[PDB]
Amino acid sequence: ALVDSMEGVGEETGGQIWDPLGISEAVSDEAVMWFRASELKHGRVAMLASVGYLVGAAKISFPGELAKGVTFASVAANGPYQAWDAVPQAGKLQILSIILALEWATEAKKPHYMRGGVPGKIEQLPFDGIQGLWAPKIKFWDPLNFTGALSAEQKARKRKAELKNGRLAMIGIISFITGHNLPGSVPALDSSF
Amino acid sequence: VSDMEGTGPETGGKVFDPMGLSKIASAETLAWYRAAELKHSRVAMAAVTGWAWVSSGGPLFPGYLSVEQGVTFESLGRDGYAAWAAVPEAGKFQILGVIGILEILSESAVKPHYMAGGTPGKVPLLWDPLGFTAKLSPETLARKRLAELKNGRLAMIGVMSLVSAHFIPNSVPLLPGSV
Amino acid sequence: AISKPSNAMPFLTAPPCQSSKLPGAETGFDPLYLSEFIDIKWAREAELKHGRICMLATVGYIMQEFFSLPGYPGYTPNPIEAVSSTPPEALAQIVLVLSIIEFNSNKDKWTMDTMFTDPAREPGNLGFDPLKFGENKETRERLAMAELKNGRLAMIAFSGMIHQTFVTGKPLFASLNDIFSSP
Amino acid sequence: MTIPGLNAPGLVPATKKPAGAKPSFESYRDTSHFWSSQGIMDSVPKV
Amino acid sequence: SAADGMEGAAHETGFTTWDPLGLADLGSPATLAFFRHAELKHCRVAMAAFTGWLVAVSGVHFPGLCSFSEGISFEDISQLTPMEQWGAVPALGKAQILLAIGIIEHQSEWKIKPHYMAAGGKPGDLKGLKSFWDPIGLTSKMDAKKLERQRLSEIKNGRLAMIGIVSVLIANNMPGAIPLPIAFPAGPSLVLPF
Numbered sequence A: 001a002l003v004d005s006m007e008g009v010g011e012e013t014g015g016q017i018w019d020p021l022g023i024s025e026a027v028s029d030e031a032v033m034w035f036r037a038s039e040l041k042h043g044r045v046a047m048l049a050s051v052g053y054l055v056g057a058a059k060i061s062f063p064g065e066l067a068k069g070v071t072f073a074s075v076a077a078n079g080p081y082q083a084w085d086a087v088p089q090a091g092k093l094q095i096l097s098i099i100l101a102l103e104w105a106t107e108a109k110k111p112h113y114m115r116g117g118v119p120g121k122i123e124q125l126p127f128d129g130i131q132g133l134w135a136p137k138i139k140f141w142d143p144l145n146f147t148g149a150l151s152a153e154q155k156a157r158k159r160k161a162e163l164k165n166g167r168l169a170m171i172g173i174i175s176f177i178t179g180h181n182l183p184g185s186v187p188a189l190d191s192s193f
Numbered sequence B: 001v002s003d004m005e006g007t008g009p010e011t012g013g014k015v016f017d018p019m020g021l022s023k024i025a026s027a028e029t030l031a032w033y034r035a036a037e038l039k040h041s042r043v044a045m046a047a048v049t050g051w052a053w054v055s056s057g058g059p060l061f062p063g064y065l066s067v068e069q070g071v072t073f074e075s076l077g078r079d080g081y082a083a084w085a086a087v088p089e090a091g092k093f094q095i096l097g098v099i100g101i102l103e104i105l106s107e108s109a110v111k112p113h114y115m116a117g118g119t120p121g122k123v124p125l126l127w128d129p130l131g132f133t134a135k136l137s138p139e140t141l142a143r144k145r146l147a148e149l150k151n152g153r154l155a156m157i158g159v160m161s162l163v164s165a166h167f168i169p170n171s172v173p174l175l176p177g178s179v
Numbered sequence C: 001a002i003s004k005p006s007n008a009m010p011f012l013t014a015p016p017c018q019s020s021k022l023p024g025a026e027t028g029f030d031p032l033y034l035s036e037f038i039d040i041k042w043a044r045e046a047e048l049k050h051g052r053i054c055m056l057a058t059v060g061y062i063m064q065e066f067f068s069l070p071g072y073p074g075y076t077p078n079p080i081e082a083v084s085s086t087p088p089e090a091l092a093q094i095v096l097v098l099s100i101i102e103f104n105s106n107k108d109k110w111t112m113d114t115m116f117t118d119p120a121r122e123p124g125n126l127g128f129d130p131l132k133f134g135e136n137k138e139t140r141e142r143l144a145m146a147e148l149k150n151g152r153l154a155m156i157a158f159s160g161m162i163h164q165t166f167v168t169g170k171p172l173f174a175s176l177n178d179i180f181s182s183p
Numbered sequence D: 001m002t003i004p005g006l007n008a009p010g011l012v013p014a015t016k017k018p019a020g021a022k023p024s025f026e027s028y029r030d031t032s033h034f035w036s037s038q039g040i041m042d043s044v045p046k047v
Numbered sequence E: 001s002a003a004d005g006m007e008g009a010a011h012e013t014g015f016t017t018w019d020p021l022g023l024a025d026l027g028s029p030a031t032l033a034f035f036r037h038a039e040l041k042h043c044r045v046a047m048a049a050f051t052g053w054l055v056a057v058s059g060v061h062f063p064g065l066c067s068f069s070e071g072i073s074f075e076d077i078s079q080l081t082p083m084e085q086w087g088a089v090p091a092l093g094k095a096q097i098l099l100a101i102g103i104i105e106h107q108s109e110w111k112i113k114p115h116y117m118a119a120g121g122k123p124g125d126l127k128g129l130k131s132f133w134d135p136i137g138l139t140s141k142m143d144a145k146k147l148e149r150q151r152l153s154e155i156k157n158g159r160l161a162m163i164g165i166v167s168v169l170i171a172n173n174m175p176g177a178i179p180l181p182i183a184f185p186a187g188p189s190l191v192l193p194f
């Protein structure tokens, strides 16, 4: 089984797969590749969101202006939750468009992950190889090539750390949002966020 | 990291990296660090020399920054942040746009890119137009590269000293209280 | 357990177009199987003609809202109203020129039986290639597939612009701004 | 307009009544599309 | 790419062909020759256009009358903005200017029998139209090395000139495009013939 040959197994659940409900046992291998790809994407998005939400909760913002009328401090004033609503529309559209470009270019790689490729290994240069499209070759992950200095075992341990941190952030960001929605649901969040 | 330039006699003839930042760096990461260090050295040297020349009562440019908008170089202020604020927004925009065109040209026009097997922080587009170091020996060129890195790091320290003196009222000992 | 299913739809049988040497034939998208009834070469000729017309038309539609011929009579950013506003003689001359072009390009080949009698005639190959992109045979498949797909997207897009202007009464990007405006 | 997510909330909570007695049969049969005269007359296409 | 032996690779793009979208790989060598000829024509026309635009803005004009029938003079045309001068030219004057340009174009296509699209075309070469290019023999003194340098200078100046003419013609109509705040002359960015 493909579920028996991954890095996500951790001692926190013993030296064994954590599939309480047998979801991985009730699906074919292709769905397991999709699961790992989506798990890592969710984890990474979640930790980006978690650190961003903490930064917003601390009222930390850049010195300058997010538009020609709004200030970074002004749009951050209300809090992290309403900050996205207070962001100008064109900026939201631009973030969504660049995320669209990223998740289209990464999807359009033919080894893929569902059809015979490493799940979670986003192609480091999504926009390369596209005919009649040009990008500056800023490779998406490790643009300055930190992981090159690591050995294979080192980066395997760090992939395990990635899975652990991504799952923890998956919990954490939703903890932030749920604490904002239901007051006292997550007692660690003050009224500031 | 041990084969790169920048080390001098002032640190035991050895590398200065207390916090291990070079141990997590491959060849490409080290090239990026060197490119960033050199570009910061260049920018900081120009910045600190300009700030010193302006705020030290040095000569200013002759006439009008904007003949139409009515801003003389003397009336700009002879104070760094205040002068930059008083510069017209169009002037700042075209300075930054020219620098951006230069940066894009630098990235796209220096073949073997510094992050793909090229020399870090070299710009054949902008260096020695006339003749200056197109004929020097390969040991004096290395010596002057080391000098560049050294006094460039000193310029980084100096320009951030000026910035701290401006923001924090009196943070630098031997700098005025109105930087 | 379909023996020869459509590539686009595995739950439908292979149409005649799928087992064909046309550009884009490796898609098998024909739920109504109109390739069986319609001659495939005629249908591809019409496909490329409509795609070319509509991929001119979409650019014309989007750029007529913004730009005008200097001092042209009866301009209106809404092209639907601008058709009536503009002189009828302009549209008459345009239709006459296009009639001349179609007649001369399809001389004695205006019908299913008449056209494609000669084997060398290819669908859409009316000989229009001044810059000679087709002499480079490596990129010919790319350009043919690209023509087909962009023409299809342009047919759909022109329908979108036309019916959006019908809905709103305002030109395309004005309606787009009104959609992407404040609540 | 209100793009859901961009310039407005996404899913919005619904308005609800906190419990209540059983509506009488004639209360909703007289408004149903199939067992009401006005319901039948309103259960027609439009254009 | 196919645009490797072609001259045009500059000092500002390393010394490699700048074809980010790979249009030179598209199509035939005939297509690339058409692209080169169009590049050089746009170059040359842009140099002429910027020089004429500077002439119009400066107000230097020929002494006399454009047409004694309509009474329009070079001075009256000079009073308008540079793009409005074309509208101010007499209609027959525009017609015969376009006739001269069309005749030159037709002879360039016709009398230069080894065609730019055809094999051995020399796409930039319009000399062959005798006494059209360099009537004074100024280029005769030069050799192959200086001729190649001057061809590269032509290409660079012309690319810059077409960017420049687009910039000046779009600056006033599109405010804030070119950052330099100066009263660029008014008028349309595009004009029709006649």
Ligand SMILES: CC(=O)O[C@H]1CC(C)(C)C(=C=C/C(C)=C/C=C/C(C)=C/C=C/C=C(C)/C=C/C=C(\C)C(=O)C[C@@]23O[C@]2(C)C[C@@H](O)CC3(C)C)[C@](C)(O)C1
Residues within 6 Å of the ligand: B094, E046, E047, E048, E050, E051, E138, E139, E150, E157, E158, E160, E161, E162, E163, E164, E165, E167, E168, E178, E179, E180
């Ligand atoms: C940064 C910012 O904000 O603004 C900037 C940028 C921005 C916007 C682009 C601007 C612009 C416009 C620009 C830069 C326009 C550039 C125009 C340009 C570059 C125009 C070339 C004309 C050349 C001609 C007519 C040459 C004929 C030459 C001929 C016919 C010869 O006979 C040459 C000759 O060699 C032969 C063949 C033989 C020799 O024996 C003799 C000589 C040597 C004579 C601004 C506003 O200005 C400034």
Ligand code: KC2
Residues within 6 Å of the ligand: A066, A067, A068, A069, A087, A088, A089, A090, A091, A092, A094, A095, A098
């Ligand atoms: C990672 C995502 C992202 C990318 C990759 C990206 C790239 C580029 C590029 C280059 C490709 C250009 C040339 C460009 C230009 C502008 N961006 Mg933009 N941008 C991103 C995100 C945001 C956000 C969140 C905002 C924003 C904005 C602006 C404004 C301000 C206009 C103003 O002063 O009103 C201008 C001119 C703000 C906005 O929309 O303001 C209404 C705003 O909030 N951007 N942006």
Ligand code: KC2
Residues within 6 Å of the ligand: B065, B066, B067, B068, B069, B087, B088, B089, B090, B091, B092, B094, B095, B098, E179, E180, E181, E182
């Ligand atoms: C290194 C950067 C740089 C470059 C490479 C560069 C090149 C050119 C070129 C040639 C290519 C021309 C033709 C040109 C023309 C004008 N420049 Mg410009 N310029 C640069 C920087 C600045 C700054 C800082 C200012 C400035 C200005 C003006 C004015 C306004 C005059 C007035 O309004 O009186 C005019 C006409 C001032 C301004 O716009 O002030 C509101 C102003 O402060 N420039 N500039």
Ligand code: KC2
Residues within 6 Å of the ligand: E066, E067, E068, E069, E070, E089, E090, E091, E092, E093, E094, E096, E097, E098, E100, E101
């Ligand atoms: C390509 C350049 C060019 C060439 C090679 C060329 C040659 C000749 C020849 C020899 C073969 C003759 C005999 C001739 C005669 C006249 N030219 Mg003419 N001409 C050129 C350009 C212009 C322009 C720009 C204008 C113009 C005009 C007139 C008028 C005035 C008529 C009048 O009073 O209206 C007369 C009599 C003006 C015009 O047509 O005004 C309506 C006007 O504006 N021409 N022109």
Ligand SMILES: CC1=C(C#C/C(C)=C/C=C/C(C)=C/C=C/C=C(C)/C=C/C=C(C)/C=C/[C@@]23O[C@]2(C)C[C@@H](O)CC3(C)C)C(C)(C)C[C@H](O)C1
Residues within 6 Å of the ligand: C024, C148, C149, C150, C152, C153, C154, C156, C167
């Ligand atoms: C497959 C393929 C391609 C493709 C494709 C693509 C992208 C195709 C896209 C097709 C697409 C996008 C098709 C939309 C149809 C929309 C319709 C019919 C809307 C009707 C809408 C109606 C009838 C609205 C009616 C009303 O408003 C009225 C009048 C008043 C209101 O009171 C009530 C409502 C709101 C109901 C390539 C990539 C281009 C090439 C390749 O080779 C082959």
